[PDB]
Amino acid sequence: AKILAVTACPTGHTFMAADALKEKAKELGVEIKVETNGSSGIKHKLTAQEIEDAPAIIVAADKQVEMERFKGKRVLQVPVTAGIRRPQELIEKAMNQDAPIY
């Protein structure tokens, strides 16, 4: 199991949020995989198996993300800016499953 994230923004912030999440996860000694949805497209797309196994998924997004793949999973939906400003809070909420089922 590992927590997952998706970051996205209209102009494709996306990458700054992914960076902040990854750097903070390393600081906290926890694994994370971050899918990005930017201007060039999708990178590090989450797999169905990763999603099944995830305690929760962080979706830090300022544009629409494909969400139906997350049905039944706990999803912490926040603005993309939250990934930059408060990655520790998001990671620790995801770990604690402090997120509603989608």
CATH class, domain 1-102, is alpha beta
> Of 9, 10, 93, 96, which is closest to residue 58 (Cα–Cα)?
93
How were these coordinates obtained?
X-ray
Tokens 């930017």, residue located:
38
Residues with Cβ within 8 Å of 5's Cβ and at least 6 positions away in sequence, in order, are 18, 21, 32, 33, 34, 35, 57, 58, 59, 60, 83, 90, 94
Our measurement of the distance from residue 37's CA atom to the centroid of its chain's CA atoms, rounded to an integer in Å, reads 11
d(CA 49, CA 75): 16
Our measurement of the distance from residue 78's CA atom to the centroid of its chain's CA atoms, rounded to an integer in Å, reads 9
d(CA 26, CA 39): 26
DSSP E strand stretches across 1-102 = 3-8, 32-38, 41-43, 57-61, 75-78
Hey, what amino acid is at 79? P
Catalytic sites, residue numbers: 9
